[PDB]
Amino acid sequence: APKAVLVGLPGSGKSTIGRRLAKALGVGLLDTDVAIEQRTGRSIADIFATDGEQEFRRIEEDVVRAALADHDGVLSLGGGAVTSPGVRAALAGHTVVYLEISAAEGVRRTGGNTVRPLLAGPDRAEKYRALMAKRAPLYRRVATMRVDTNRRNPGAVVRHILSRL
Ligand SMILES: Nc1ncnc2c1ncn2[C@@H]1O[C@H](COP(=O)(O)OP(=O)(O)O)[C@@H](O)[C@H]1O
Ligand SMILES: [Cl-]
Ligand SMILES: [Cl-]
Ligand SMILES: [Cl-]
Ligand SMILES: [Cl-]
Ligand SMILES: [Cl-]
Ligand SMILES: [Cl-]
Ligand SMILES: [Mg+2]
Ligand SMILES: [Pt+2]
């Protein structure tokens, strides 16, 4: 099982804390989005456009289930994975770290146009707040550890987790 599975909104730090936490532990980081693009060969966007939500989530759950069983390092879960009941079920029993972030800080951490589908240019703040209202209850439901990252620098978040593992 993974040493830790990181979940949270876009910009909460899943990729960043994931990479840094994995390095600290001397283990590897597996990003479900990356695993999906490498399993299929197509990009996230392409899968959504062609196949669409339902098909994506299905491929995603499949990748997530294999990761939870085969990966022993740090696992960073795609932000919408928890919307799938099957994923929430698969997570039961694992160490799940919910990286919490405010909407104001979250929207600002993701302003780099690093490909944020759900956060289209027009009124990103409103969209981000809506995303939070929808996803937060789910992250809270699957989390075994909650970590506020609002005023904590990345290294502090990593040390916080490391000390609790
Ligand atoms: N604790 C933090 N303090 C300051 N900036 C952070 C922190 N965590 C993440 N960030 C920054 O916010 C951006 C989004 O981080 P990222 O790991 O890609 O988030 P996610 O994978 O959850 O979408 C990155 O540029 C990252 O360096
Ligand atoms: Cl995300
Ligand atoms: Cl399973
Ligand atoms: Cl590993
Ligand atoms: Cl299960
Ligand atoms: Cl909000
Ligand atoms: Cl909130
Ligand atoms: Mg990520
Ligand atoms: Pt909120």
Swiss-Prot record:
GO biological process: amino acid biosynthetic process; aromatic amino acid family biosynthetic process; chorismate biosynthetic process
This enzyme's EC code(s): 2.7.1.71
Binding site for Mg(2+): S15
Catalytic activity: shikimate + ATP = 3-phosphoshikimate + ADP + H(+)
Chain positions covered by the region annotation LID domain: 111-123
GO cellular component terms, A-Z: cytosol
Keyword presence, Cell membrane: no
Pathway membership: Metabolic intermediate biosynthesis; chorismate biosynthesis; chorismate from D-erythrose 4-phosphate and phosphoenolpyruvate: step 5/7
InterPro entries membership: P-loop_NTPase, Shikimate/glucono_kinase, Shikimate_kinase/TSH1, Shikimate_kinase_CS
Cofactor(s) this protein requires: Mg(2+)
Cofactor note: Binds 1 Mg(2+) ion per subunit.
Keyword annotations: Amino-acid biosynthesis, Aromatic amino acid biosynthesis, ATP-binding, Cytoplasm, Kinase, Magnesium, Metal-binding, Nucleotide-binding, Transferase
Binding site for ATP: G11, S12, G13, K14, S15, T16, R116, R152
Function: Catalyzes the specific phosphorylation of the 3-hydroxyl group of shikimic acid using ATP as a cosubstrate.
Assembly and interaction partners: Monomer.
Record-stated family: Belongs to the shikimate kinase family.
Protein name (Swiss-Prot/TrEMBL): Shikimate kinase
Organism listed in the record: Mycobacterium tuberculosis (strain CDC 1551 / Oshkosh)
Lineage: Bacteria, Bacillati, Actinomycetota, Actinomycetes, Mycobacteriales
